[PDB]
Coordinates of C-alpha atoms in Angstrom, one line a residue:
Chain H
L995 CA 1.7 -25.1 -18.2
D996 CA 2.0 -25.2 -22.0
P997 CA 3.1 -21.9 -23.5
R998 CA 1.7 -23.0 -26.9
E999 CA -1.9 -22.7 -25.8
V1000 CA -2.0 -19.9 -23.2
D1001 CA -2.7 -16.7 -25.2
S1002 CA -1.5 -14.9 -28.3
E1003 CA -0.3 -11.6 -26.9
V1004 CA 2.4 -13.2 -24.7
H1005 CA 4.0 -14.7 -27.9
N1006 CA 5.3 -11.3 -28.8
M1007 CA 7.5 -10.8 -25.7
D1008 CA 11.3 -10.3 -25.8
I1009 CA 13.8 -12.8 -24.5
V1010 CA 17.1 -10.9 -25.4
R1011 CA 19.7 -9.5 -23.1
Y1012 CA 20.2 -6.4 -25.2
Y1013 CA 18.9 -4.9 -28.4
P1014 CA 21.3 -5.0 -31.3
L1015 CA 22.7 -2.0 -33.1
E1016 CA 20.6 -2.7 -36.1
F1017 CA 17.4 -1.9 -34.1
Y1018 CA 18.7 1.5 -33.0
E1019 CA 19.9 2.3 -36.5
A1020 CA 16.5 1.3 -38.0
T1021 CA 14.5 3.3 -35.5
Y1022 CA 15.8 6.5 -37.2
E1023 CA 14.0 5.4 -40.4
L1024 CA 10.6 5.2 -38.8
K1025 CA 10.2 1.5 -39.9
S1026 CA 7.5 -0.8 -38.8
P1027 CA 8.1 -3.5 -36.1
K1028 CA 7.1 -6.3 -38.6
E1029 CA 10.2 -5.6 -40.7
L1030 CA 12.7 -6.4 -37.9
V1031 CA 10.7 -9.1 -36.1
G1032 CA 13.4 -11.6 -36.9
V1033 CA 16.3 -9.5 -35.6
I1034 CA 15.1 -9.4 -32.0
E1035 CA 14.3 -12.8 -30.5
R1036 CA 10.7 -13.3 -29.2
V1037 CA 8.8 -16.0 -27.4
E1038 CA 7.2 -17.2 -30.7
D1039 CA 10.6 -18.0 -32.1
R1040 CA 11.0 -20.7 -29.4
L1041 CA 7.7 -22.5 -29.5
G1042 CA 7.9 -26.2 -29.9
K1043 CA 11.5 -26.6 -28.9
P1044 CA 12.2 -27.7 -25.3
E1045 CA 13.5 -24.3 -24.2
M1046 CA 10.3 -22.4 -23.8
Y1047 CA 10.6 -22.8 -20.0
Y1048 CA 14.4 -22.8 -19.8
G1049 CA 16.0 -19.4 -20.6
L1050 CA 14.5 -16.0 -20.8
Chain N
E2 CA 11.9 -33.8 -24.3
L3 CA 12.1 -31.5 -21.4
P4 CA 15.4 -31.3 -19.5
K5 CA 16.0 -32.9 -16.0
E6 CA 14.8 -29.8 -14.1
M7 CA 11.4 -28.8 -15.7
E8 CA 10.3 -32.5 -15.4
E9 CA 11.2 -32.6 -11.8
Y10 CA 9.4 -29.3 -11.1
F11 CA 6.2 -30.6 -12.7
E12 CA 6.5 -33.9 -10.9
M13 CA 6.8 -32.2 -7.6
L14 CA 3.7 -30.0 -8.3
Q15 CA 1.7 -33.1 -9.2
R16 CA 2.9 -34.8 -6.0
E17 CA 1.7 -31.9 -3.9
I18 CA -1.7 -31.8 -5.8
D19 CA -2.2 -35.5 -5.1
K20 CA -1.3 -35.0 -1.5
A21 CA -4.1 -32.4 -1.1
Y22 CA -6.6 -34.4 -3.2
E23 CA -6.3 -37.5 -1.0
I24 CA -7.4 -35.6 2.1
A25 CA -10.2 -33.8 0.1
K26 CA -11.5 -37.1 -1.1
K27 CA -11.3 -38.7 2.3
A28 CA -13.2 -35.9 4.0
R29 CA -16.0 -35.7 1.4
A30 CA -16.8 -39.4 1.6
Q31 CA -18.4 -39.1 5.1
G32 CA -21.5 -37.7 3.5
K33 CA -21.8 -34.3 5.2
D34 CA -21.9 -32.5 1.8
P35 CA -24.1 -32.3 -1.3
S36 CA -22.0 -35.0 -3.0
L37 CA -19.9 -37.9 -2.0
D38 CA -16.8 -36.9 -4.0
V39 CA -14.8 -33.8 -5.0
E40 CA -16.4 -31.7 -7.7
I41 CA -13.3 -30.2 -9.5
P42 CA -11.6 -32.6 -12.0
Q43 CA -8.1 -31.8 -13.0
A44 CA -7.1 -31.4 -16.7
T45 CA -3.7 -31.4 -18.3
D46 CA -4.2 -30.0 -21.9
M47 CA -6.8 -28.3 -24.1
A48 CA -8.5 -31.6 -25.1
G49 CA -9.1 -32.5 -21.4
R50 CA -10.6 -29.1 -20.7
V51 CA -12.8 -29.3 -23.7
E52 CA -14.0 -32.8 -22.9
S53 CA -14.8 -31.9 -19.3
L54 CA -16.6 -28.6 -20.2
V55 CA -18.6 -29.1 -23.3
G56 CA -18.0 -32.7 -24.5
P57 CA -19.0 -34.9 -26.2
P58 CA -17.3 -37.8 -24.3
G59 CA -14.2 -39.3 -25.9
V60 CA -13.4 -36.2 -28.0
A61 CA -10.0 -35.8 -26.2
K62 CA -8.0 -38.3 -28.2
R63 CA -9.5 -37.2 -31.5
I64 CA -8.7 -33.5 -30.8
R65 CA -5.1 -34.6 -29.8
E66 CA -4.4 -36.5 -33.0
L67 CA -6.1 -33.9 -35.2
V68 CA -4.1 -31.1 -33.6
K69 CA -0.9 -33.2 -34.1
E70 CA -1.7 -33.7 -37.8
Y71 CA -3.2 -30.5 -39.1
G72 CA -3.2 -27.7 -36.6
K73 CA -5.8 -25.8 -34.6
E74 CA -8.4 -24.4 -37.0
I75 CA -8.2 -27.3 -39.4
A76 CA -8.5 -29.7 -36.4
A77 CA -11.6 -27.8 -35.2
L78 CA -13.2 -28.1 -38.6
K79 CA -12.5 -31.8 -38.9
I80 CA -13.9 -32.3 -35.4
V81 CA -17.0 -30.4 -36.5
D82 CA -17.3 -32.7 -39.5
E83 CA -16.9 -35.9 -37.4
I84 CA -19.6 -34.7 -35.0
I85 CA -21.9 -33.9 -37.8
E86 CA -21.4 -37.4 -39.4
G87 CA -21.9 -38.9 -36.0
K88 CA -18.7 -40.6 -34.8
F89 CA -19.2 -39.9 -31.1
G90 CA -22.8 -41.1 -30.9
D91 CA -26.4 -40.5 -31.9
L92 CA -27.8 -37.3 -30.4
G93 CA -31.2 -36.6 -31.9
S94 CA -32.6 -33.9 -34.2
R95 CA -30.6 -31.5 -36.4
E96 CA -30.9 -28.8 -33.7
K97 CA -29.0 -31.0 -31.2
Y98 CA -26.2 -31.7 -33.7
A99 CA -25.9 -28.0 -34.6
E100 CA -25.7 -26.9 -30.9
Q101 CA -23.2 -29.6 -30.0
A102 CA -21.0 -28.8 -33.0
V103 CA -21.0 -25.0 -32.5
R104 CA -20.2 -25.4 -28.8
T105 CA -17.4 -27.8 -29.3
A106 CA -15.9 -25.8 -32.2
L107 CA -16.0 -22.5 -30.2
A108 CA -14.4 -24.3 -27.3
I109 CA -11.6 -25.7 -29.4
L110 CA -10.8 -22.4 -31.2
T111 CA -10.8 -20.7 -27.8
Chain I
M775 CA -23.4 -25.0 18.2
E776 CA -23.4 -28.3 20.0
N777 CA -22.0 -30.0 17.0
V778 CA -18.9 -27.8 16.6
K779 CA -18.6 -26.5 20.2
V780 CA -18.5 -22.9 19.0
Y781 CA -20.9 -21.0 21.3
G782 CA -19.4 -17.5 21.4
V783 CA -20.5 -15.9 18.1
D784 CA -22.3 -12.6 17.9
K785 CA -23.5 -12.3 14.3
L786 CA -24.1 -14.9 11.5
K787 CA -25.4 -13.6 8.2
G788 CA -27.3 -15.6 5.6
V789 CA -29.2 -14.9 2.4
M790 CA -32.8 -13.8 1.7
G791 CA -33.3 -16.6 -0.9
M792 CA -31.2 -19.3 -2.6
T793 CA -30.6 -18.5 -6.3
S794 CA -30.0 -22.1 -7.5
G795 CA -32.6 -24.4 -9.0
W796 CA -32.1 -27.0 -6.2
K797 CA -32.1 -24.5 -3.3
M798 CA -29.9 -26.8 -1.4
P799 CA -28.6 -25.1 1.8
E800 CA -25.1 -25.1 3.3
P801 CA -24.3 -26.6 6.8
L802 CA -24.5 -24.1 9.6
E803 CA -21.3 -25.3 11.2
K804 CA -19.3 -23.9 8.3
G805 CA -21.0 -20.6 8.8
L806 CA -20.2 -20.6 12.5
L807 CA -16.5 -21.4 11.8
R808 CA -16.4 -18.7 9.2
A809 CA -17.9 -16.2 11.6
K810 CA -15.5 -17.3 14.3
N811 CA -12.4 -16.9 12.1
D812 CA -13.6 -13.7 10.2
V813 CA -13.9 -14.9 6.6
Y814 CA -16.6 -14.5 4.0
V815 CA -18.2 -16.8 1.4
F816 CA -18.8 -16.5 -2.3
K817 CA -21.6 -17.6 -4.6
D818 CA -20.1 -21.1 -5.1
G819 CA -18.9 -21.7 -1.5
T820 CA -15.3 -20.5 -1.8
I821 CA -13.3 -17.8 -0.1
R822 CA -11.4 -15.5 -2.5
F823 CA -9.0 -12.6 -2.6
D824 CA -8.8 -10.0 -5.4
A825 CA -5.6 -8.3 -6.5
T826 CA -4.0 -6.5 -9.4
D827 CA -1.7 -8.7 -11.5
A828 CA 1.9 -7.7 -12.5
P829 CA 4.6 -9.7 -14.3
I830 CA 8.0 -11.0 -13.3
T831 CA 10.6 -13.4 -14.7
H832 CA 13.7 -13.0 -12.5
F833 CA 13.7 -12.4 -8.8
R834 CA 16.2 -11.8 -6.0
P835 CA 16.1 -13.8 -2.7
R836 CA 16.2 -10.6 -0.6
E837 CA 13.3 -8.8 -2.2
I838 CA 10.9 -11.5 -1.2
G839 CA 12.5 -12.3 2.2
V840 CA 13.4 -15.9 1.7
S841 CA 16.7 -17.5 2.7
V842 CA 18.9 -19.4 0.3
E843 CA 18.5 -22.6 2.2
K844 CA 14.7 -22.5 1.8
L845 CA 15.1 -21.7 -1.9
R846 CA 17.4 -24.7 -2.3
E847 CA 14.8 -26.8 -0.5
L848 CA 12.1 -25.6 -2.9
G849 CA 14.2 -26.6 -5.9
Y850 CA 16.3 -23.6 -7.0
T851 CA 20.0 -24.3 -7.3
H852 CA 21.6 -22.0 -9.8
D853 CA 21.2 -18.3 -10.7
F854 CA 20.4 -17.1 -14.2
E855 CA 24.0 -17.3 -15.4
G856 CA 25.0 -20.8 -14.3
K857 CA 26.9 -20.0 -11.1
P858 CA 25.8 -21.9 -8.0
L859 CA 23.3 -20.2 -5.8
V860 CA 25.2 -19.1 -2.6
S861 CA 24.2 -15.5 -1.9
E862 CA 21.0 -13.5 -1.5
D863 CA 22.0 -10.8 -4.0
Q864 CA 22.2 -13.1 -7.0
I865 CA 19.4 -13.0 -9.6
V866 CA 17.4 -16.2 -9.9
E867 CA 14.9 -17.2 -12.6
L868 CA 11.2 -17.8 -11.8
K869 CA 9.6 -21.1 -12.7
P870 CA 6.4 -20.8 -14.6
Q871 CA 3.9 -21.6 -11.8
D872 CA 5.5 -19.9 -8.8
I873 CA 3.8 -16.8 -7.4
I874 CA 4.9 -14.0 -5.1
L875 CA 1.9 -12.9 -2.9
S876 CA 1.4 -9.5 -1.3
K877 CA 1.2 -9.1 2.4
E878 CA -2.5 -8.3 2.7
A879 CA -3.1 -11.6 0.8
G880 CA -0.9 -13.5 3.2
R881 CA -2.6 -11.9 6.2
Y882 CA -6.0 -13.0 4.9
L883 CA -4.9 -16.4 3.8
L884 CA -3.7 -17.0 7.3
Chain C
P14 CA -25.2 -30.6 44.4
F15 CA -23.3 -27.7 46.0
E16 CA -24.7 -24.3 47.2
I17 CA -23.0 -20.9 47.2
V18 CA -24.4 -17.7 48.7
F19 CA -23.1 -14.1 48.3
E20 CA -24.0 -10.7 49.8
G21 CA -24.3 -7.7 47.6
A22 CA -25.1 -9.3 44.3
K23 CA -24.3 -6.0 42.4
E24 CA -20.6 -6.5 43.2
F25 CA -20.7 -10.0 41.8
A26 CA -22.5 -8.8 38.7
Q27 CA -20.0 -6.0 38.1
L28 CA -17.1 -8.4 38.6
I29 CA -18.6 -10.9 36.1
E30 CA -19.3 -8.1 33.6
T31 CA -15.7 -6.9 33.9
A32 CA -14.3 -10.4 33.4
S33 CA -16.6 -11.0 30.5
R34 CA -15.6 -8.0 28.5
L35 CA -12.7 -9.8 26.9
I36 CA -13.6 -13.5 26.8
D37 CA -16.9 -15.0 25.6
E38 CA -16.8 -18.7 26.5
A39 CA -15.7 -19.3 30.1
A40 CA -15.4 -22.4 32.3
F41 CA -15.5 -22.0 36.1
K42 CA -13.7 -24.6 38.3
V43 CA -15.5 -25.3 41.6
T44 CA -13.4 -26.7 44.4
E45 CA -13.4 -26.6 48.2
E46 CA -10.6 -24.0 47.9
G47 CA -13.0 -21.7 45.9
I48 CA -14.3 -20.7 42.6
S49 CA -11.5 -20.0 40.0
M50 CA -11.4 -19.0 36.3
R51 CA -8.7 -18.8 33.7
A52 CA -9.2 -18.0 30.0
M53 CA -7.7 -16.2 27.1
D54 CA -9.3 -13.8 24.6
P55 CA -9.4 -14.9 20.9
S56 CA -6.5 -12.6 20.1
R57 CA -4.3 -14.3 22.8
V58 CA -3.2 -10.8 23.8
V59 CA -4.8 -10.6 27.3
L60 CA -4.8 -13.3 30.0
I61 CA -7.5 -13.3 32.6
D62 CA -7.3 -15.0 36.0
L63 CA -10.1 -14.8 38.5
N64 CA -9.8 -16.3 42.0
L65 CA -12.7 -16.4 44.6
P66 CA -11.6 -18.0 47.9
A67 CA -14.0 -19.8 50.2
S68 CA -13.6 -17.1 52.9
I69 CA -15.3 -14.3 51.0
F70 CA -18.6 -16.2 50.4
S71 CA -21.1 -16.0 53.3
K72 CA -22.2 -19.6 52.8
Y73 CA -20.1 -22.3 51.0
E74 CA -20.7 -26.0 50.8
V75 CA -19.0 -28.0 48.0
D76 CA -18.6 -31.8 48.2
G77 CA -16.1 -32.6 45.5
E78 CA -15.1 -30.7 42.4
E79 CA -16.5 -30.3 38.9
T80 CA -16.2 -27.7 36.1
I81 CA -19.2 -25.7 34.8
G82 CA -19.3 -24.0 31.5
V83 CA -21.7 -21.0 31.1
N84 CA -22.1 -18.7 28.2
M85 CA -21.1 -15.2 29.3
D86 CA -24.1 -13.3 27.7
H87 CA -26.9 -15.0 29.6
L88 CA -25.0 -15.1 32.9
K89 CA -24.1 -11.4 32.5
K90 CA -27.7 -10.4 31.8
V91 CA -29.1 -12.5 34.7
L92 CA -26.5 -11.1 37.2
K93 CA -27.1 -7.6 35.9
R94 CA -30.8 -8.1 36.7
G95 CA -29.9 -8.1 40.4
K96 CA -29.9 -5.1 42.7
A97 CA -27.6 -3.3 45.3
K98 CA -28.9 -4.9 48.5
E99 CA -29.8 -8.4 47.3
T100 CA -28.5 -11.9 48.2
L101 CA -27.2 -14.0 45.3
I102 CA -27.7 -17.7 45.5
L103 CA -26.0 -20.0 43.0
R104 CA -26.9 -23.7 43.0
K105 CA -26.1 -26.7 40.7
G106 CA -28.1 -29.9 41.2
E107 CA -27.6 -33.4 39.8
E108 CA -29.2 -32.0 36.6
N109 CA -27.2 -30.1 33.9
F110 CA -28.9 -26.8 34.8
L111 CA -27.5 -23.8 36.8
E112 CA -29.9 -22.2 39.2
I113 CA -29.4 -18.5 40.0
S114 CA -31.7 -17.0 42.7
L115 CA -31.9 -13.4 43.8
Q116 CA -33.2 -13.0 47.4
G117 CA -34.7 -9.7 48.4
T118 CA -38.3 -8.7 48.9
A119 CA -39.3 -11.7 46.7
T120 CA -37.4 -14.7 45.4
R121 CA -36.6 -14.8 41.6
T122 CA -35.0 -17.9 40.2
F123 CA -33.4 -18.3 36.8
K124 CA -32.1 -21.4 35.0
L125 CA -29.2 -21.8 32.6
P126 CA -28.3 -25.1 30.9
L127 CA -24.6 -25.9 30.9
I128 CA -22.6 -25.9 27.7
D129 CA -19.5 -28.0 26.8
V130 CA -16.6 -25.6 26.4
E131 CA -13.3 -27.2 25.5
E132 CA -10.7 -26.4 28.2
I133 CA -7.0 -25.6 27.4
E134 CA -4.7 -25.1 30.3
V135 CA -2.4 -22.1 29.9
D136 CA -0.7 -20.2 32.8
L137 CA 2.0 -17.6 32.9
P138 CA 4.3 -17.9 36.0
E139 CA 6.1 -15.0 37.6
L140 CA 8.2 -12.8 35.3
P141 CA 11.3 -10.7 36.1
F142 CA 9.4 -7.5 36.8
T143 CA 11.4 -4.3 37.2
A144 CA 8.9 -1.7 38.4
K145 CA 5.8 -1.7 40.7
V146 CA 3.2 1.0 41.2
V147 CA 0.0 1.2 43.2
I148 CA -2.6 3.8 42.0
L149 CA -6.3 4.5 42.2
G150 CA -8.8 3.5 39.5
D151 CA -10.2 7.1 39.2
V152 CA -6.9 8.4 37.8
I153 CA -5.8 5.5 35.4
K154 CA -9.3 5.5 33.9
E155 CA -9.2 9.3 33.2
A156 CA -5.7 9.0 31.8
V157 CA -6.5 6.1 29.5
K158 CA -9.6 8.0 28.3
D159 CA -7.4 11.1 27.6
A160 CA -4.8 9.0 25.8
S161 CA -7.5 7.3 23.6
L162 CA -8.8 10.9 22.9
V163 CA -5.4 11.6 21.2
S164 CA -3.7 8.3 20.1
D165 CA -4.0 4.6 19.6
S166 CA -1.1 3.5 21.8
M167 CA 0.0 4.3 25.3
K168 CA 3.5 4.3 26.9
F169 CA 4.4 3.6 30.5
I170 CA 7.6 5.0 32.1
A171 CA 8.5 4.7 35.7
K172 CA 11.3 6.2 37.8
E173 CA 12.1 6.8 41.4
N174 CA 9.4 8.9 43.2
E175 CA 7.4 9.4 40.0
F176 CA 5.1 7.6 37.6
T177 CA 4.6 8.9 34.0
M178 CA 2.4 7.7 31.2
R179 CA 2.4 9.0 27.7
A180 CA 0.6 8.6 24.3
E181 CA 1.8 9.9 20.9
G182 CA -0.2 10.6 17.7
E183 CA 0.1 12.0 14.2
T184 CA -0.7 15.6 15.2
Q185 CA -1.4 15.7 19.0
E186 CA 0.3 14.4 22.1
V187 CA -0.7 13.9 25.8
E188 CA 1.3 13.1 28.9
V189 CA 0.4 12.6 32.5
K190 CA 2.9 12.4 35.3
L191 CA 2.6 12.3 39.1
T192 CA 4.7 11.9 42.3
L193 CA 4.3 10.2 45.6
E194 CA 3.2 13.5 47.2
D195 CA 0.1 13.3 44.9
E196 CA -3.0 11.4 46.0
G197 CA -2.9 9.6 42.6
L198 CA 0.1 7.6 43.9
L199 CA 0.0 5.4 47.0
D200 CA 3.3 3.5 46.7
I201 CA 6.1 2.9 44.3
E202 CA 9.4 0.9 44.0
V203 CA 11.8 0.8 41.1
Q204 CA 14.7 -1.6 40.2
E205 CA 15.9 0.2 37.1
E206 CA 14.7 2.3 34.2
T207 CA 11.5 1.1 32.6
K208 CA 9.7 1.8 29.3
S209 CA 7.0 -0.1 27.5
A210 CA 4.0 0.4 25.2
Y211 CA 0.6 -1.4 24.9
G212 CA -2.5 -1.1 22.8
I213 CA -5.2 1.3 24.0
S214 CA -8.4 -0.6 23.1
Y215 CA -7.5 -3.5 25.5
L216 CA -6.6 -1.0 28.2
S217 CA -9.9 0.7 27.8
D218 CA -11.7 -2.6 28.0
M219 CA -9.9 -3.8 31.1
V220 CA -9.9 -0.6 33.1
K221 CA -13.5 0.2 32.4
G222 CA -15.9 0.2 35.4
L223 CA -13.2 0.9 38.0
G224 CA -14.4 2.7 41.1
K225 CA -13.4 6.1 42.4
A226 CA -11.6 4.8 45.5
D227 CA -10.2 1.3 44.7
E228 CA -6.6 0.3 45.0
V229 CA -5.0 -0.9 41.8
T230 CA -1.5 -2.5 41.7
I231 CA 0.4 -2.5 38.4
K232 CA 3.7 -4.2 37.5
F233 CA 5.6 -4.0 34.3
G234 CA 9.1 -4.0 32.8
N235 CA 11.0 -3.3 29.6
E236 CA 9.4 -4.8 26.5
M237 CA 7.7 -7.5 28.5
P238 CA 3.9 -8.0 29.2
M239 CA 2.1 -5.8 31.7
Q240 CA 0.3 -7.2 34.8
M241 CA -2.4 -5.3 36.7
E242 CA -4.5 -6.6 39.6
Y243 CA -7.0 -5.4 42.1
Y244 CA -8.5 -7.1 45.1
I245 CA -12.2 -7.7 46.1
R246 CA -13.1 -7.8 49.8
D247 CA -9.3 -8.0 50.3
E248 CA -9.2 -11.7 49.6
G249 CA -10.4 -12.3 46.0
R250 CA -8.0 -11.3 43.3
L251 CA -8.5 -10.5 39.6
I252 CA -5.5 -10.5 37.3
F253 CA -4.9 -9.2 33.7
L254 CA -1.7 -10.0 31.8
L255 CA -1.5 -7.7 28.7
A256 CA 1.0 -8.5 26.0
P257 CA 3.1 -5.6 24.7
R258 CA 3.7 -4.2 21.2
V259 CA 6.6 -5.1 19.0
Chain V
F443 CA 9.7 -3.8 -28.1
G444 CA 7.1 -6.6 -28.0
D445 CA 4.5 -4.0 -27.1
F446 CA 5.1 -2.2 -30.4
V447 CA 4.8 -5.5 -32.4
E448 CA 1.6 -6.5 -30.7
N449 CA -0.2 -3.2 -31.3
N450 CA 1.4 -2.7 -34.7
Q451 CA 2.8 0.8 -33.9
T452 CA 5.4 2.5 -36.1
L453 CA 8.8 2.7 -34.4
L454 CA 9.8 6.0 -33.0
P455 CA 13.4 7.4 -33.0
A456 CA 15.3 6.3 -30.0
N457 CA 16.7 8.7 -27.5
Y458 CA 20.4 8.3 -26.8
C459 CA 21.2 6.0 -23.9
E460 CA 24.0 4.0 -22.4
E461 CA 23.0 0.7 -24.0
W462 CA 23.7 2.3 -27.4
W463 CA 26.9 4.1 -26.4
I464 CA 28.4 0.8 -25.2
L465 CA 27.7 -0.9 -28.5
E466 CA 29.3 2.0 -30.4
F467 CA 32.2 1.9 -28.0
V468 CA 32.9 -1.8 -28.5
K469 CA 32.5 -1.6 -32.3
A470 CA 34.9 1.3 -32.6
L471 CA 37.4 -0.5 -30.3
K472 CA 37.3 -3.5 -32.6
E473 CA 37.5 -1.5 -35.8
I474 CA 40.5 0.5 -34.6
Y475 CA 42.6 -1.9 -32.5
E476 CA 41.1 -5.3 -33.4
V477 CA 40.0 -6.2 -29.9
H478 CA 36.9 -8.4 -29.4
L479 CA 34.8 -7.5 -26.3
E480 CA 31.1 -7.7 -25.4
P481 CA 28.9 -5.8 -23.0
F482 CA 26.7 -7.3 -20.3
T483 CA 28.9 -10.4 -20.0
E484 CA 32.4 -11.3 -18.9
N485 CA 35.4 -11.2 -21.3
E486 CA 38.8 -12.9 -21.5
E487 CA 41.6 -11.4 -19.4
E488 CA 44.0 -11.0 -22.4
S489 CA 41.5 -8.8 -24.3
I490 CA 40.8 -6.7 -21.2
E491 CA 44.6 -6.2 -20.6
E492 CA 45.2 -5.3 -24.3
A493 CA 42.3 -2.8 -24.4
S494 CA 43.4 -1.2 -21.1
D495 CA 47.0 -0.9 -22.4
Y496 CA 45.7 0.8 -25.6
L497 CA 43.3 3.2 -23.8

């Protein structure tokens, strides 16, 4: 299995234990999810490095 | 590369697959079937799947190196160009070249 | 029947006409054994089971009814926080190519 | 090259039909002691044992011993072709064919080539039974029909001087009980409290065809397989061992 | 949250839940008494004792 060439929808999944306070504070402003895509870690943020299989 | 657990996992999986494949190959050799060998090859990455499905033969290494260098879409375009110029062998008329190139490119980008 | 020593079969269904371009038939011994064991064939000669797919990343050794000794034999040794795997209530992480079947699937695959 | 004769071929045909309602491939062992059969159904739930001594048969001449495998469908049809007051003659020459002859007003002979059925030896010795009961077929047949009318499983409970059998369903229930004073009970003996459950399709298959005035002996225990037997001509014995549920 | 990114859907205001209250709780504790704690994990014993003495 190579997560780099499986699909493109599974690259948007979450691998965080809990959402930060910034996410909840920004939800009240009706923002778009592309603005805070770097705040919450996703699968795409780990591609290439050895820990795509390791810790989710 | 991978740590000392993922590699062991994949190695055990390959060992079990080999263990099943040996029996399947041994049984099919006795000739009680349409063919004298198993009819499902095993791939490992995208280049192997593309080579086994649409061809042309030998495209696996070229896809590998082109993906390492440029990317996915650019590597598909360079593979199309190499097919058109005729690196992998003479096919025939322009229709054959067009069909082969479109099939291989749609398989790569997919 | 003399070949496989399976004489007690009531029904054995075939096809009206082969759809391939070779119209090569299948050995009747396989059909007799399938009828004896109550399994059915598909268009390419394989037996398949269809189910809805759901995701999972972490499991618990008690939800799936597997002892910790068996899990350690399979290759799992730590839970998802680094502690050694000693209980059935700890949360373990699922390797990418490990599946948890249903029970209808297990009954049919038997 | 043996030769076996029977009187009242209808009884033999009914016996073979009863024994062939659970198994499909059977192998009969022929010895000087007598014809015997032992096989298991595909589900391995019911065990069938059939024993025909040499005393019941009118004429018996066997020199040696050899097993014969016959498919149950053809044998059942040929035997069912017989009548009430016919004489059944079974023969097996040096060839691989079985000759069945029905002797009445005229002689009619059938032939059945033998088949090679693989033989697996499996026997269940005596078990620590806790209850015994002797009843007639007429009743047990009616009770199992009534239980199948209502449910899919049947329960057997035995106590002193009484025999009770029950079945429970989603919306309806049925129970039948009787005592020694009733004609439905001939004898009974109890070691301790008993309770067990078994499937109803198997019971329907095994108890089907029982006569109105035949003696049937049943033994069972707690959460252990049931055994039921009934004699033919007071020498031959037919045994069913039914595995329980859970 | 990855289902909102994939379909490109505008974020909706979040109903109050325990996973927000716990973050507010730990932040207020740090701001007032200068104690460092963290939810969903295990903390040092000195910080636990100090926070329990304060509260």
